[PDB]
Amino acid sequence: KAVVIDDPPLRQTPEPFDEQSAYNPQSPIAIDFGSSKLRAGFVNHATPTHIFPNALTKFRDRKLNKNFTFVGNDTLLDQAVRSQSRSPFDGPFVTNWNLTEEILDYTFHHLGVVPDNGIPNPILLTERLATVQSQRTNWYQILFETYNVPGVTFGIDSLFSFYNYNPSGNKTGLVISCGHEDTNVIPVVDGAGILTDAKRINWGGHQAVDYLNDLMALKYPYFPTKMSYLQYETMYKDYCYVSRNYDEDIEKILTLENLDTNDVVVEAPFTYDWRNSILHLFLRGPRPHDSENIHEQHQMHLNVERIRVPEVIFQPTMGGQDQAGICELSETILLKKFGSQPGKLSQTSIDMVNNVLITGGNAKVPGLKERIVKEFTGFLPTGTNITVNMSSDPSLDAWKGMAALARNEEQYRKTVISKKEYEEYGPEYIKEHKLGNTKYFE
Amino acid sequence: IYIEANTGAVKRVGRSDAYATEFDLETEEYVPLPKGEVHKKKEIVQDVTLHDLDVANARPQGGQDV
Amino acid sequence: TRRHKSARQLISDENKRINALLTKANKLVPKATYFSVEAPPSIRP
Numbered sequence A: 001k002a003v004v005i006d007d008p009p010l011r012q013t014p015e016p017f018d019e020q021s022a023y024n025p026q027s028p029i030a031i032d033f034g035s036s037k038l039r040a041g042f043v044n045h046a047t048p049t050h051i052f053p054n055a056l057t058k059f060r061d062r063k064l065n066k067n068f069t070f071v072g073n074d075t076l077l078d079q080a081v082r083s084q085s086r087s088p089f090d091g092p093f094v095t096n097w098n099l100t101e102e103i104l105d106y107t108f109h110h111l112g113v114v115p116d117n118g119i120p121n122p123i124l125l126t127e128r129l130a131t132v133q134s135q136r137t138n139w140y141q142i143l144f145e146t147y148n149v150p151g152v153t154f155g156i157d158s159l160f161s162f163y164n165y166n167p168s169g170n171k172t173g174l175v176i177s178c179g180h181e182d183t184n185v186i187p188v189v190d191g192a193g194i195l196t197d198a199k200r201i202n203w204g205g206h207q208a209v210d211y212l213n214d215l216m217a218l219k220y221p222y223f224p225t226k227m228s229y230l231q232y233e234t235m236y237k238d239y240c241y242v243s244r245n246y247d248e249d250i251e252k253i254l255t256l257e258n259l260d261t262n263d264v265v266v267e268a269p270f271t272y273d274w275r276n277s278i279l280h281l282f283l284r285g286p287r288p289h290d291s292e293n294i295h296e297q298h299q300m301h302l303n304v305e306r307i308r309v310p311e312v313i314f315q316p317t318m319g320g321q322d323q324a325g326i327c328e329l330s331e332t333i334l335l336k337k338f339g340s341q342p343g344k345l346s347q348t349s350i351d352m353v354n355n356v357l358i359t360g361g362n363a364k365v366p367g368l369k370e371r372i373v374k375e376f377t378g379f380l381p382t383g384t385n386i387t388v389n390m391s392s393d394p395s396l397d398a399w400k401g402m403a404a405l406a407r408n409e410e411q412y413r414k415t416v417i418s419k420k421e422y423e424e425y426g427p428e429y430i431k432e433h434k435l436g437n438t439k440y441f442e
Numbered sequence B: 001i002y003i004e005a006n007t008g009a010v011k012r013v014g015r016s017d018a019y020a021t022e023f024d025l026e027t028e029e030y031v032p033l034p035k036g037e038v039h040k041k042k043e044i045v046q047d048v049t050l051h052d053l054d055v056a057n058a059r060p061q062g063g064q065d066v
Numbered sequence C: 001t002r003r004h005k006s007a008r009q010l011i012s013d014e015n016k017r018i019n020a021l022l023t024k025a026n027k028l029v030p031k032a033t034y035f036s037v038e039a040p041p042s043i044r045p
Helices: A079-083 A098-109 A133-146 A157-165 A205-219 A227-237 A277-286 A326-334 A346-352 A368-380 A397-407 A419-425 B050-056 C008-026
Strands: A029-033 A037-040 A051-053 A056-060 A066-073 A123-126 A153-156 A173-178 A183-189 A199-201 A264-267 A299-302 A356-358 A389-390
Touching: A029 A397, A037 A098, A037 A397, A051 A326, A051 B050, A056 A098, A066 A098, A123 A326, A123 A397, A133 A153, A133 A419, A133 C008, A153 A157, A157 A183, A173 A326, A173 A346, A183 A326, A183 A346, A183 A389, A183 B050, A199 A205, A205 A227, A277 A299, A326 A346, A326 A368, A356 A368
Parallel strands: A029 A123, A123 A153, A173 A356, A356 A389
Antiparallel strands: A029 A037, A037 A051, A056 A066, A173 A183, A183 A199, A264 A299
């Protein structure tokens, strides 16, 4: 029996706000400007209090002649107001800036804050790796002029999750983050991220679901009903896994002994034998195809793509990116760098092996940890104890990162930038600390 | 490749399967990786006769190659 | 006022900026830029 997918259901209730009496001006504010979702709240709380995708609508009402503004979870109330959602992220950066100001105003309104002459709380901000000077300049402008905050500090979300899962701040490990739009590999030495050996592959969740979108467009060019981006996102989330060995799995997934079990049929919502032909297996699975059935031609068949699309991270040549794979880049980092002779692991490499951490938004795909453990056992010398740590939800460990950082006041003051330092040194200033970006030169 | 430690026997099985896409058509055979460990130790028992050792030392033309 | 400044010209703007910095230094090795972290191509076929 084929399954039918839809859009995710809209929220029946709107998002509540925190009580204004519980606000104190001494507590900092933790924000995570992710490419997919926004996480906002205090520091003393450990559990999340505000998670919503970054979107905004300008709903023009006919009767009142007033442009209403719906932010984040308020966009998940009607289908028309969901479809007109606009993200501020254009590419891997931000381009429109006033949208960032009104979503920050929405977070400040929904945090239960009654401020005066701007926000009196220092803020904790995550930023992408090798961030371009213009957006951090504009960030300094908006926080140091629009919101009057006393202090600011910055860092990478992957290193922040690494510091969260290694709270001593002096450990050695190798972090891997699979973000919404980029995949990063950072070798960490003694609690400090070695960013001169960091590596980035231009693929993420957004490129993967666009790969699903144009793969489904190419596979069924005569499909009548255009399905939205959310359907592609949901069936990528629910019906995709990392293959344990892509060379051996691809030579048997088209057999009839797998297509009875490993084929997912997805029904679109609306109101000379075929056994020996692999076109009929690839398009219509192991069940015979009747072109006169109305429910039949509204169907996807996910047989090869479920193991094909997570393999783009391991081999970027499928996705068109002329880059080395995650396993090959990790081999380059681990076997020929940090004083490690190929064939003779240094103690830095041995310490990096035992603290391999996978985080990010795109670690939810099953079979990733077992596959990277299999590859690591494949290329390392025999007898090396390989440890891979994976969170239950690796999309929230960054907020745990700034929570543990601002709870640790001893090392919190090493990374902060006040109004006074910015005012004396301008926007062009780099604060060289362990858990953030370094200087662009030597 | 195949290396025996005690006698130094060298046998080339073939090129690895990961290097099978350097050319679309090639004269080399591509064998996969060995699924076991690199190092393999095994104790055998060899049974020979005295006539075999008599004929091993008494080759008139000369010793044969591998 | 603020120009829209799409992300397509931003990489070229940073490339021109870092080229300006290296040419003024030439008249200094980079450490961690956008074009230096970015991945080398695969050696295996």
